[PDB]
């Protein structure tokens, strides 16, 4: 369960100790918070909130339209998906993978992919205004 220690030691990443509810967090480029949560189903769910949606108006509708059709494509491995938080404004990108098929070199591929995809959706949702 703390097998990530090879993954962080592999890529020079600060420690990941899952405490007080087996949750561990990482900070990406001072802007995003990555969440390494352990499913009770022997899976590793990566989730990162990456921005906000407009509270009202046509800007919210255009973002709502963008969110619904975005999950139709394969956005990412581990069935990565776009979602809106219960607060009604935070955009959440989350996906999960079973730990048994998760070593360290494959984590790095899944780790960079969520980062690269998190960057892309932060930009497209901030580029709605046109």
């Amino acid at each position: 369960q703390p097998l990530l220690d090879e993954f962080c030691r592999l890529n020079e990443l600060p420690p990941l100790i899952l405490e007080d509810g087996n949750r561990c967090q990482l900070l990406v480029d001072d802007r995003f918070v990555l969440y390494f949560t352990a499913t009770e189903d022997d899976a590793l769910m990566l989730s990162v909130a990456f921005g906000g949606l407009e509270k009202s108006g046509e800007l919210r509708v255009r973002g709502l339209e963008l969110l619904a059709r975005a999950n139709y494509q394969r956005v990412g491995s581990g069935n990565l998906a776009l979602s809106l938080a219960p607060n009604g404004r935070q955009l959440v990108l989350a996906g999960r993978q079973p730990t048994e098929h998760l070593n360290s070199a494959n984590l790095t591929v899944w780790f960079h992919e969520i980062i690269e995809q998190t960057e892309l959706w932060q930009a497209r949702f901030a580029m709605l205004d046109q």
Binding site: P14, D30, R31, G57, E58
Partner: protein
């Protein structure tokens, strides 16, 4: 002296809320200073350290923007444009591409003529002290200052003895009480898809002769598309409006006129008729200042001191309610009828609205010309109610496009 000049701020200016920082002579997004990604582990020591680290550059970036402005323009011009971001900047709030776009757009306006925006800012500074405006913001901003106006109502001379402002406060406590109750408590994202297209017509109406564009068009643009049209992306000029700098018992806040909720809060706060208690010469000089500044913006949007506008049922005078329904009839039946009807009323020719707005479609015929016409078919009672309105206030038309009356 590795300070970025104004051109590097203009380059990053965009209608986006992405945080930028000034560092090593350039200003851009913090991630773009390094080719790779950088990572950190959260913990009680680092989040308090990371926050102090962010707070300290938001201020440094604001001051570099201020320094860049001061180098390029006269200090009076540069500091007027910088005032938009100064109070929020001092509190560690982040400088974003939209704020820079606002500041740079504002600077391009006050460069040529600064008296217009200086009037607006002084007016906005006065209404920022008004509790009525402040509770109105609370209505549109759940979470920011809940219970400010309500728990403000349980006060008197013992709690607030003062003839500098606390005399002005007490005089507004009735208006506060009316203003907290009215509305949906949040109002609403009252749009039908057409409410975006309605505010497009108000834009044209704002450009009619004798009608204000400096205040109404940025407000109408924000309600339609979520933000005003800024200069760098009378007349609308820069499209930048002053900030609502709110300081009260709940905290220190800054509200951008580019936020729809802020426009709606100002809108409701400008609706009611002149509160003669605060406008009284015998009244506290502060109360005089807040009410006079409120009637100034109200009059700018065509709303006379006599005009009383409140969100109701979708109270208005018998001629008002029939006029509002005539406006709704024009809006729902055609796309280009409201503007010519408002124009006819502006000229006192409201009785000619049916014939003026008539569309004539010639068929093929003989012995003369046969036409097919479409007319608004406003009843005689509706034409008279419109004529009784004189020049319809942009504020009332703005209330209609939002579905408030």
């Amino acid at each position: 002296s590795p300070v970025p000049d104004l051109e590097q701020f203009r380059a990053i200016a965009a209608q986006k809320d992405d945080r930028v920082i000034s560092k090593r002579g350039e200003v851009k997004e913090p991630s773009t200073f390094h080719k790779g990604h950088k990572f950190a582990s959260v913990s009680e020591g680092v989040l308090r350290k990371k926050y102090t680290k962010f707070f300290q550059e938001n201020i440094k970036t604001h001051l570099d923007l201020k320094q860049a402005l001061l180098k390029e323009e006269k200090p009076e011009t540069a500091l007027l444009a910088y005032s938009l971001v100064s109070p929020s900047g001092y509190r560690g709030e982040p400088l974003t591409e939209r704020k820079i776009l606002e500041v740079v757009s504002l600077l391009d306006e006050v460069k040529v003529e600064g008296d217009t925006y200086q009037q607006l800012k002084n007016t906005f500074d006065s209404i920022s002290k008004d509790p009525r405006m402040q509770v109105s913001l609370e209505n549109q901003y759940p979470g920011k200052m809940d219970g400010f106006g309500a728990q403000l109502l349980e006060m008197g001379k013992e709690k607030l003895k003062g003839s500098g402002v606390n005399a002005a406060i007490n005089l507004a406590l009735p208006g506060v009480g009316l203003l907290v109750a009215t509305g949906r408590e949040l109002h609403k994202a009252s749009v039908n898809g057409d409410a975006e297209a309605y505010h497009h017509q108000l834009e044209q109406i704002s450009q009619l002769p004798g009608r204000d564009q400096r205040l109404s068009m940025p407000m109408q643009q924000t309600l339609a598309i979520g933000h005003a049209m800024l200069s760098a992306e009378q007349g609308p000029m820069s499209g930048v409006l002053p900030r609502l700098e709110i300081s009260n018992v709940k905290g220190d806040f800054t509200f951008s006129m580019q936020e729809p909720a802020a426009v709606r809060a100002l809108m409701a706060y400008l609706g009611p008729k002149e509160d003669t208690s605060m406008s009284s010469p015998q009244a506290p000089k502060e109360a005089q200042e807040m009410e006079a500044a409120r009637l100034t913006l109200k009059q700018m949007l065509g709303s006379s001191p006599n005009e009383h506008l409140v969100p109701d049922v979708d109270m208005p005078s018998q001629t008002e309610s029939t006029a509002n329904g005539a406006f709704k009839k024009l809006l729902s039946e055609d796309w280009d009828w409201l503007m010519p009807a408002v124009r006819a009323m502006d000229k006192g020719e409201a009785n000619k609205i049916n014939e003026k707005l008539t569309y004539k479609l010639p068929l093929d015929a003989a012995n003369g010309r046969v036409y097919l016409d479409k007319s608004p078919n406003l009843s005689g009672a509706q034409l008279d109610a419109l004529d009784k309105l004189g020049s319809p206030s942009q504020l009332r038309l703005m209330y209609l496009a939002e579905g408030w009356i």
